[PDB]
Write a protein that binds this DNA or RNA. Structure first.
Ligand code: GLP
Ligand code: MG
Ligand code: MG
Ligand code: MG
Ligand code: MG
Length: 90
RNA sequence: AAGCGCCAGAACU
RNA sequence: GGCACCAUUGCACUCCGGUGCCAGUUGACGAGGUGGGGUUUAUCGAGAUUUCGGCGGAUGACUCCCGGUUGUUCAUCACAACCGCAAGCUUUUACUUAAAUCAUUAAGGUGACUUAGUGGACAAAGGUGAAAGUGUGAUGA
């Protein structure tokens, strides 16, 4: 079911936190207001990102339009996030 | 304006 | 913090795989101190994760040398203890802005941390200027 946060994986894990953040912002801010982008390079979480849209409608067009889009040489996979970001529940 | 300077170990990022 | 490799396709919201290599960062808080040669593990305390470990300095210490003080004028020689522009020993007296830690709040840095301000303390050694005692003989004016 649709969500404010879209889950992105298959991201190039050689890209550092700061850069991948901004690049993601560069690519995804046309869909709507991005509240935060969450990114970590740990064993569990590397190659993955959470983009938190203010409006779900924006998240939907994001997932739809950028699905499989080559980014740092790898086509990204995008999913509606399992749970809400706590910052969206708050 | 000399318990002062440096930084190869160590620890920390 | 960064890079290569190995491994990882992983659904999170206080960071969080391993190895190697590079980078960065921490690494002494003040007080005190220099005649020359030598030797050597270079004085005082405050603090308390490294103020540890390594390297390099260094005014210390001991000893030798040289030049001087005191041992009641004043030379000369030894003797006893000192001094390096000070100067026997006992033995009281004030002076010699401690600084950091600690607390606190700004700036910078991705970060480890860094710089600076603010607040209040608390030393020891050595030294310096007073004060009371108790330290030579030989020869010559
Ligand atoms: N004042 C100190 C000395 O007392 C100390 O001996 C010397 C070497 O210190 P360390 O051996 O700890 O490096 O440094 C300073 O000069
Ligand atoms: Mg210092
Ligand atoms: Mg000093
Ligand atoms: Mg040391
Ligand atoms: Mg040393």
């Amino acid at each position: 079911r649709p969500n404010h946060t879209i889950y992105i994986n298959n991201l190039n894990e050689k890209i550092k936190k700061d850069e991948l953040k901004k690049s993601l912002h560069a690519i995804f801010s046309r869909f709507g207001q991005i509240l935060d982008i969450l990114v970590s390079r740990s064993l569990k979480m590397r190659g993955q990102a959470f983009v938190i849209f203010k409006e779900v409608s924006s998240a939907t067009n994001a997932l739809r339009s950028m699905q499989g889009f080559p980014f740092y040489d790898k086509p990204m996979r995008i999913q509606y996030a399992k749970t809400d970001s706590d910052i969206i529940a708050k």
